[PDB]
Enzyme design. Structure first.
Site, PDB file in Angstrom:
ATOM      1  N   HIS C  92       2.488  -6.873  25.191  1.00 16.35           N
ATOM      2  CA  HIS C  92       2.876  -6.496  23.832  1.00 16.35           C
ATOM      3  C   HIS C  92       4.228  -7.131  23.548  1.00 16.35           C
ATOM      4  O   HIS C  92       4.919  -7.569  24.472  1.00 16.35           O
ATOM      5  CB  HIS C  92       3.033  -4.972  23.710  1.00 16.35           C
ATOM      6  CG  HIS C  92       1.785  -4.196  24.014  1.00 16.35           C
ATOM      7  ND1 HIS C  92       0.709  -4.135  23.156  1.00 16.35           N
ATOM      8  CD2 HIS C  92       1.451  -3.431  25.082  1.00 16.35           C
ATOM      9  CE1 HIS C  92      -0.231  -3.367  23.675  1.00 16.35           C
ATOM     10  NE2 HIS C  92       0.192  -2.928  24.845  1.00 16.35           N
ATOM     11  N   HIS C 252       0.909   6.687  -5.002  1.00 11.27           N
ATOM     12  CA  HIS C 252       0.990   7.475  -6.229  1.00 11.27           C
ATOM     13  C   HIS C 252       1.271   8.929  -5.834  1.00 11.27           C
ATOM     14  O   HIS C 252       0.601   9.482  -4.967  1.00 11.27           O
ATOM     15  CB  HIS C 252      -0.352   7.416  -6.983  1.00 11.27           C
ATOM     16  CG  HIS C 252      -0.405   8.294  -8.196  1.00 11.27           C
ATOM     17  ND1 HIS C 252      -0.052   7.853  -9.454  1.00 11.27           N
ATOM     18  CD2 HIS C 252      -0.720   9.606  -8.334  1.00 11.27           C
ATOM     19  CE1 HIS C 252      -0.143   8.853 -10.313  1.00 11.27           C
ATOM     20  NE2 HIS C 252      -0.546   9.930  -9.659  1.00 11.27           N
TER      21      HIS C 252
HETATM   22  O1  LIG Z   1      -3.152  10.999  -9.825  1.00  9.45           O
HETATM   23  N1  LIG Z   1      -3.789  10.697  -8.566  1.00  9.45           N
HETATM   24  O2  LIG Z   1      -5.211  10.779  -8.469  1.00  9.45           O
HETATM   25 CU   LIG Z   2       0.752  -4.799  21.135  1.00 11.26          CU
HETATM   26 CU   LIG Z   3      -4.388   9.654 -10.409  1.00 13.62          CU
END
Ligand SMILES: O=N[O-]
Ligand SMILES: [Cu+2]
Ligand SMILES: [Cu+2]
Ligand SMILES: O=N[O-]
Ligand SMILES: O=N[O-]
Ligand SMILES: [Cu+2]
Ligand SMILES: [Cu+2]
Ligand SMILES: [Cu+2]
Ligand SMILES: [Cu+2]
Lengths: 336, 336, 336
Positions: C92, C252
């Site tokens: 990694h 949102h």
């Molecule tokens: O207003 N969000 O579905």
């Molecule tokens: Cu990794």
């Molecule tokens: Cu919405």
């Protein structure tokens, strides 16, 4: 404002009109704050979304997909009477992205068939905003069944560009874009169902592929073409409001531009300018302002061209006026 | 300006160069407005796009995918002679998103095999813009077969930052990104076809899944890597123009940044700054300006890493110079 | 700065906390530049991502998906001690989008199980940035296995709006969004494996569809709900940092807004305002500032509602305080 002060404000009842048209309004606010009243009846109804006759059991605000554009000014109050007729079979509500509190109003407007409710909210922020139904546990199904629209909260002094110059449109259109997920049978033909509930399981399977079968404007492939094409004239200033409540889109006026585009849909965020293709993320509305300069037909599309021309996201504008050879001219027409 | 004034402007023919390189130009305009002439021949030809010999019947402006970058200044006129040899099988045209009128020029340049056309348009808006073929009824098929490119309309005074300071690059590259949709047989092997048209139905079916089989730069997986990596030196200022005519992309310079990025591609819209990953919607071009600070190999990718490392959207930059330990240093190399 | 000058700077050891919480820090820089030290141990462990017991072989920085948020100030140096325990099976490394050079540090931090490394870089650019593992040849696989996080490089003077007024938050949360691609068997059931490498081939086939089976916050459906819902109170200012290392998202706040949103995540790029739904492209981090004005439960979602409510991209905020009837009120509650 106190309850007393709000009760003293003037009231104005507005009659809504079907998209892509917008009800009468003034860009610059007439007087002080008002309580603007709207009424919408929800209709679960079968609609045809393409020339083949494909059906969808739409869940429609005011009977249309998208729902109508409500217009108010900043600091006005929007008071919506929302009605769910007893003829419907599902509970519905409404979430205004423009509103503040209770999930956009969703938590206060859950109405079963046979009920109504009146919600009032202060439109504190200017811009275009999506509104959509969102019943807990069945949110995307209602939204992708067409239960969404947008509102426009105009600044009290109208629109201005990023440097403070007034921008006044001659006309406005509201283009609601809808992603549909229609189940298909073994022959790849779209299925039809008796009632909305019958299509649920099959529809969620399609929704999970995140691949719509149709992406349309005003509820159907070709809805804004032919005698329903939008219109303008050379020199005319047009504002095109565009919304997508569930999925990203990238509007483009073919042959034109977005002279000023509030891509985020918010008027206090300066608009981008001279745009070729703008971007509106799922769950938002945006608006583009353009002054036509050339006559003829224009296509207005979601610029993932497969979505535009194979899936349905294309509209037309018919523009009258004189051709400008300075801007463009065919020096030599197609010839051997 | 008057008819006589346009006719009196100097005419200048420019020789194009294949992407990612760009033809000679000056950042600040030299002289007043001119009619800059370019000529491009359209080539329909099979190209191999990956290490498994996968074929695509490309539709290539000037024989390349993407088509070449044409560079002019704001208010110059771009006059293109477009040629469709009789050896081709399809009608083609061109839509300049930079142009105004007739669907970007598409309505005036429909040429059948054996025909040519000359289109002139005034480049009124500054920025990088997509151009692409768009025959009515088969628009996405031509675009996703690689028939697209971009142009750059520089401000007459060259580029500037959001504060008005000049931004002068030392070199410029044009990365055209292409989403391809190649049909497969039931065993998962990519299909081959004799003529372009033979693949139409199979290809549209793949297009409808909105899932490209390949997402590449300069027309093929690894086209801008290895011995074809782009180059720079520490201290050098580079402009990277990027376009995608049909689908969204999110460019990222691995180990670097976009110091100034006109994400919308329009120079009158102030550039975003210090970007890690920018976003260019399908149907647009964008431009990023960066001053290299560290030597070494950089990757430049579409940052949906599956698209970059599984589908092909990854390029390299080989940068010469002295390492800066202030900016970055291995305090303790990997050790047990 | 010279090596000597850097050596003389004060050092500060930071203790990291699991997302969505953020380690203690000061918005305005306390004193001059310092070398901020962090240590992270990489853990390859199984995580259950949905209520059907679906497993993912996570490759987690600090043992969590997303990895923890690291906060420094512009021009401080970030010195990370990264450890790959002998108990892990893969190599990694780490690429900081905030850093300059060697593929963001990825080229200098490749550690096999049993090794550790110390990388130091100067945080020259202010904003939120993604960091992620990127082993040559297997980059997306590690990233979509949850090996990514973000850091925030605050301006020395703290945050400010577009006009220079200070923006000081009361609380900060870090939401890491993850797209997962879990293989299914012939009956649609998710497969389980006893080794990370065992699922590689099956996982790559799902990744190539570009269609995630799950899209979640903090590594699992419903992670940031219930016992893990984020909290605030009316009047409190909250900064929500959101990242997505491989795929686009559109945050949102349901019932709220993004008062100020650095959508590109970069602090020298003025924030957008009054946002309903913002957009963060795959490969980037963004940040939204909001002052809560209403009490209650808020949903915070990726606004492609299918991704939020079918695939898992939904979180909750529980806000205390007094309801504001001026902003919103139920004039008539749901009734016959
Ligand atoms: O207003 N969000 O579905
Ligand atoms: Cu990794
Ligand atoms: Cu919405
Ligand atoms: O210019 N739109 O295809
Ligand atoms: O920082 N690019 O994976
Ligand atoms: Cu509903
Ligand atoms: Cu063509
Ligand atoms: Cu176009
Ligand atoms: Cu990266």
């Amino acid at each position: 404002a106190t309850a007393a002060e709000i009760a003293a404000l003037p009231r104005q009842k507005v009659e809504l009109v079907d998209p892509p048209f917008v009800h009468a309004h003034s860009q610059v606010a007439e007087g002080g704050p008002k309580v603007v009243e709207f009424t919408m009846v929800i209709e679960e109804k079968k609609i045809v979304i393409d020339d083949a006759g494909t059906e969808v059991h739409a869940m429609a605000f005011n009977g249309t997909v998208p729902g109508p554009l409500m217009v108010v000014h900043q600091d006005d109050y929007l008071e919506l009477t929302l009605i769910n007729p007893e003829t419907n079979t599902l509970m519905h509500n409404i979430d205004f992205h423009a509103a503040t509190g209770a999930l956009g109003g969703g938590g206060l407007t859950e109405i079963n068939p046979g009920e109504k409710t009146i919600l009032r909210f202060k439109a504190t922020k200017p811009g275009v905003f999506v509104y959509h139904c969102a019943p807990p546990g069945m949110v995307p199904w209602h939204v992708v069944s067409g239960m969404n629209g947008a509102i426009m909260v105009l600044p009290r002094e109208g629109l201005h560009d990023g440097k403070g110059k007034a921008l006044t449109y001659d006309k406005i259109y509201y283009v609601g874009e809808q992603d549909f997920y229609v189940p298909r049978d073994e022959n790849g033909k779209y299925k039809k169902y008796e009632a909305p509930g019958d299509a649920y399981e099959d529809t969620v399977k399609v929704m999970r592929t995140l691949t719509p079968t149709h992406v349309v404007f005003n509820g159907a492939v070709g809805a804004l073409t032919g005698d329903k094409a939008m219109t303008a004239a050379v020199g005319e200033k047009v504002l095109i409001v565009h919304s997508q409540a569930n999925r990203d889109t990238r509007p483009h006026l073919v042959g034109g531009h977005g002279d000023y585009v509030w891509a985020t849909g918010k008027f206090n965020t300066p608009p981008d300018v001279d745009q070729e293709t703008w971007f509106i993320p799922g769950g938002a509305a945006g608006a583009a302002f353009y002054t036509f300069q050339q006559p003829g037909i224009y296509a207005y599309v979601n610029h993932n061209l497969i979505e535009a021309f194979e899936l349905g996201a294309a509209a037309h504008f018919k523009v009258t006026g004189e051709w400008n050879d300075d801007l463009m001219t065919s020096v030599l027409a197609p010839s051997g």
